[PDB]
């Protein structure tokens, strides 16, 4: 099986997708984000933080008031089980994370804490 997907975030903050599979054989999972738009950085910046669903707004909340110097993420977060870098236009990052910090049976979200942004670049990643 695959253990690699390839997302990309737009300049109208939408996601490429809003459903990750992770299958069970996998032990490594690989996340390969991308920015194919023309707004920089501080304007439509764009990560992938991984999270539980409980964990999920208190990441982004924490994260708005975390600055874009902290990349939108409060420091030594022990929420996120993994996240890219910010990026801006034309540019790319890809994270890499063991499939054992995944459960079977719990849901987990994907998002951008960008300001605002986890509205509509949300998304659901579940260990099959
Ligand atoms: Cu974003
Ligand atoms: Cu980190």
Same mark, same amino acid.
């Given at each position: 099986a695959e253990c690699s997907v390839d997302i990309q975030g737009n300049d109208q903050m939408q996601?490429?997708?809003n459903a990750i599979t992770v299958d069970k054989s996998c032990k490594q999972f690989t996340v390969n984000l991308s920015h194919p738009g023309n707004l920089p950085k501080n304007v439509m910046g764009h990560n992938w933080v991984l999270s539980t669903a409980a964990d999920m707004q208190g990441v982004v909340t924490d994260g708005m008031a975390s600055g874009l110097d902290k990349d939108y993420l409060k420091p +030594? +977060?022990?929420?996120?089980?993994a996240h890219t870098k910010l990026i801006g236009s034309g540019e790319k990052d890809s994270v890499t994370f063991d499939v054992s910090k995944l459960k079977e049976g719990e849901q987990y979200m994907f998002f951008c804490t960008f300001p605002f942004h986890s509205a509509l670049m949300k998304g659901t990643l579940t260990l099959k």
């Open positions: 996601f490429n997708t +030594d +977060d022990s929420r996120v089980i």
